[PDB]
């Protein structure tokens, strides 16, 4: 519960304190409501039943007060339930973009997707459905138990012992199925991961004949999910029957004690009949707890996944604003080193790029030339050394100022499910429509609008799957050209474009109106035409650099690179 309370907003803690008072008031009235029956019924079965009128008055007063508190405790429980939900989901949504890229391992992405997937109403009522019946049935059966000490000590002590064994039985039910519910959650989570892969990589699986359940990886995930699913019920339902039966055994036991005390003469017959009736109030709270064990574990699991995201390592940052806010910054590396895990990517990479000029990066695949554009954009950060944008270390840059200083054309262009214009507008949603058409026209996206029926309203699929390979590449280029950032990083933006569109896009990238410091990566010589400078990177180090004509005349590795 300690992880639960800390997730509430600071402004909402006033409602948390008020909720606890009404939760104590509600139990106290309900226990008092049970106490007022024993004088009532004992007076009712007596020779002077007129005394019942007084004790009926306090029961109605406590009953109405119980209704008022219970409706208000639900409203505070509802408000607190969504206050935690809206706060945590907004915190996770604002945290994940700043979380380090290495954090998104296949398992971590599953918990992050599951944690985001808990936005439904099942977690919204984590207070009303789970805490309120649980707290009400932890304090009230004991409150009735202590109240019975003033009517019969053996019966009152038995009631307190009943709370001990009933909660003890609940603990044993949880301990039994804790191991099974751990396996159930993992196998149920892995099934979700494989369904996503099944529907996302369907083309690769089908051609590989890996889609039948008898051989698919999702088929194995379902089979394992079923085995853990059944195994949970086998170790869960015996927990619930033992608790449910022990509740009825306890109740009939106390009703037996009330009768037995009557036989021995320690308890009046009217008071015994009153206690037999009132003791149903002892089992009423414990009845709710019986079926909340599945709810308690699922709620505990989601709150663990939520807290896992909020414990994720945020990327380092500073508060320095970029000095060249408008002009083109000078990009440079100062002994920048970087490594994914253990494999060394960059070792002793150092170059200085002039402001406003266009520079090309070339080299064999796996060299580490997408990593260079990642470090400049701030997606990655060096293990040692520092990247400077106009003499300002990127690690010290304000993250708002860090993203505004770079625009990237990613190697694998990803588009979001939506219209074509929406994906172009994410580069600069405040852009004038003239700027949007200028960017689309420059990136040759106007060709798509002529061909496609809807024009700039075609509903792209997940990723760019409802567009061709070159169509989503030109939407990516238009997205990057629209952003007014003074640095443009181009990571193989002409891979899936024919010679007609590649030649036009290359002109647009290197001849857009505003000034920028342009870095280009490409595996085609026509994609780095008339570039001012070149950077050849083979082993994660810049082997040679200079102008294209100088390198071709020199006859180094650059000349052999395009020889074939």
């Amino acid at each position: 519960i300690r992880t639960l309370l800390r997730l509430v907003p600071a402004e909402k803690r006033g409602a948390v304190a008020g909720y606890a008072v009404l939760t104590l008031l509600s139990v106290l009235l309900r226990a008092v409501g049970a106490v007022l029956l024993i004088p009532l019924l004992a007076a009712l079965f007596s020779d002077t039943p007129s005394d019942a009128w007084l004790w009926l008055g306090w029961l109605t007063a406590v009953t109405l007060a119980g209704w008022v508190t219970d409706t208000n405790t639900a409203r505070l429980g509802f408000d607190l339930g969504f206050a935690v939900l809206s706060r945590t989901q907004h915190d996770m949504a604002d945290r994940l973009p700043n979380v380090a890229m290495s954090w998104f391992t296949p398992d971590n992405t599953a918990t992050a997707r599951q944690a985001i997937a808990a936005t439904g109403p099942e977690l919204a009522g984590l207070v009303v459905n789970l805490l309120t019946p649980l707290i009400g049935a932890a304090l009230l059966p004991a409150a009735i138990g202590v109240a019975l000490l003033f009517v019969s000590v053996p019966l009152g002590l038995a009631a307190l012992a009943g709370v001990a064994v009933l909660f003890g039985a609940l603990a044993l039910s949880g301990r039994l199925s804790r191991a099974a519910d751990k396996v159930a959650g993992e196998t149920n989570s892995a099934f979700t991961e494989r369904i996503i892969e099944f529907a996302r990589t369907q083309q690769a699986l089908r051609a590989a004949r890996r889609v039948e359940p008898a051989r698919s990886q999702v088929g194995s995930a379902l089979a394992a999910q079923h085995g853990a699913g059944l195994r949970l019920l086998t170790m869960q339902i015996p927990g619930q029957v033992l608790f449910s039966l022990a509740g009825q055994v306890a109740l009939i036991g106390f009703r037996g004690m009330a009768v037995w005390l009557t036989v021995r003469g320690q308890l009046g017959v009217p008071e015994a009949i009153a206690l037999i009736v009132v003791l149903v109030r002892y089992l009423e709270p414990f009845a709710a707890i019986a079926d909340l064990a599945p709810a308690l574990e699922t709620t505990r699991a989601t709150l663990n996944r939520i807290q896992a995201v909020l414990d994720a390592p945020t990327l380092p940052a500073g508060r320095r604003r970029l000095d060249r806010t408008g002009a083109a910054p000078s990009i440079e590396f100062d002994d920048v080193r970087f490594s994914y895990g253990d494999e060394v990517v960059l070792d002793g990479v150092s170059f200085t790029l002039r402001p406003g000029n266009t520079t090309a990066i070339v080299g064999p695949s796996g060299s580490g030339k997408t990593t260079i554009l990642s470090l400049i954009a701030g997606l990655q950060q060096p293990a040692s050394g520092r990247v400077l944008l106009d003499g300002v270390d990127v690690t010290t840059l304000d993250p708002e100022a860090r993203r505004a200083a770079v625009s990237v054309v990613f190697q694998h262009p990803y588009l979001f499910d939506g219209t074509l214009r929406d994906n172009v507008l994410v580069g600069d949603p405040e852009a004038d429509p003239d700027d949007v058409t200028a960017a689309m026209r420059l990136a040759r996206v106007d060709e798509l609008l002529d061909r496609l029926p809807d024009g700039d309203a075609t509903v792209v699929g997940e990723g760019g799957t409802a567009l061709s390979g070159g169509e989503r590449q030109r939407v990516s280029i238009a997205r990057a050209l629209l952003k007014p950032a003074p640095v443009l990083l181009v990571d193989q933006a002409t891979s899936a474009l024919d010679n007609a569109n590649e030649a036009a896009v290359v002109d647009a990238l290197t001849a857009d109106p505003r000034p920028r410091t342009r870095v280009i990566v490409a595996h085609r010589l026509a994609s780095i035409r008339h570039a001012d400078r070149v950077l050849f990177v083979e082993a994660g180090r810049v082997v040679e650099d200079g102008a294209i004509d100088e390198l071709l005349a020199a006859g180094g590795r650059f000349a052999q690179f395009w020889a074939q």
Binding site: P106, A117, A124, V218, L222, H226, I273, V426, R524, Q564
Partner: protein, 562 residues
Amino acid sequence: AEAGSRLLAPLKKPLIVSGVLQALITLIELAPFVLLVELARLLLGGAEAERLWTLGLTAVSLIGLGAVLAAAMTLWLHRVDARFAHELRGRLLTKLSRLPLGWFTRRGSASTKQLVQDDTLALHYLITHAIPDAVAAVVAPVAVLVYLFVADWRVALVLFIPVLVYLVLMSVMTIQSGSKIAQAPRWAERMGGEAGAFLEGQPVIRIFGGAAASRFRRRLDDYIDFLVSWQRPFVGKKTLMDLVTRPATFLWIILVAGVPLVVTGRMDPVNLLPFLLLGTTFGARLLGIGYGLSGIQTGMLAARRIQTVLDEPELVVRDRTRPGTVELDRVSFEYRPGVPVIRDVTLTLRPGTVTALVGPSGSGKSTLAALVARFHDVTQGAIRVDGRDIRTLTADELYRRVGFVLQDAQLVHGSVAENIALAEPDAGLERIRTAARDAQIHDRITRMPDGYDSVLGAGSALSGGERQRVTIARAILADTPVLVLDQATAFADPESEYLVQQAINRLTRDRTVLVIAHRLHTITHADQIVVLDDGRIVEVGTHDELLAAGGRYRGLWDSGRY
């Protein structure tokens, strides 16, 4: 619902048995309270201790018997309705492997997750608890109220007041929440879509827009607005129902009309004993259907939504019913109605010949490979592999004869060995290494920390030019007579591209190869270059013949040198 009732038809007999056994169980559960009424009535009469104890023991045994029979049903009924989900989920995964891939692209992986896992889970209440709760919620209140009405009609009507109020709350709660429950699965799919897009397209979110301007934040706030507007009156009515049907509410209402009747000479106090013991017992049973009718609505919609997918048209294998030959005979295809992507394409691929399919981006050269794969059925014409139509060929006979590289390095979440061995998972580790060496990626994989066992899920991927070489190695390992390379070596540098091209030419000397490429300098050696513009083949011929003809290919070639 025709589709809702048709899905859950196999569970007719198990569900009817659940209803009948619950009628017996609820009567067994009410039995000890009737004995307690007699036991309490004997205490007033001061009967002997032995007589009271016998009523105590027969009441305890019925509590035990009712709990055993109650637990026997729930354990049985959850196993029957957990195996149904496994049967149902296996049917869906079998169904999805037979639908055209236009189904997958227009819905995505977020809706398929909703279908297989969430919707099949939403059926749980409709079959496990719906009939037991509906039968116990009518057997026990009617059984008690018939008993109590015979005892005293005056207090029975007073106890009947909260029954009517509860029904009014139950009805208004159900109809008001009815419209929202219909919209609920739609929002879950859309929110599931953003969560997948937000987590997958993270480099886009970081650089463009950032955390604040992301569409995930916008739709997340919109979704919580839907939940608040949905769950606020829903939970507001649920608490009121719980208060009306609480044991303390009936007990107060009994005593409101009980005390004036006992105090006045209008009711002996013995006649209150049935009400105090039985009147409060059926409050928790009426509440079962109040909280369930919402769960039935989600189940019935989920059953309707599941059955609709199972009725979708499939890629049916026809009964109509040179080696390595593929023939397109006036093929024409439309991804959407009235949007022709391919138009009257006639193309014959023969063994031992490399066909080079070039043209403008978005012309249709990837969808032609898709049609050959039979991810979609041609709208007109026919595609025949070795004289057998692909529509007559089963999936095994088709994909054993044709192998593919799909322009996307769709790596599965698994080891490097398994991504290369996706076609034949039981391929030997030496066979996997030989395929990888032909793709020029064995040297890379040996440098990874765990070798070929290294996992290639999100966050442990390879470079863009290396995840493609894995799929090239996969196709090499599959080694089908017909190969369709959809822009392999797009992200490869010239050195690796030349090496893998040499390996593929060595491998497929006596095989059909359809190479798709925008880099025309690797196409000059193709036996026939097929130029595809706007989905129609505008010119066919060798490299020199196309250059002499001076058409679209000459335009692309001249523009290539820039």
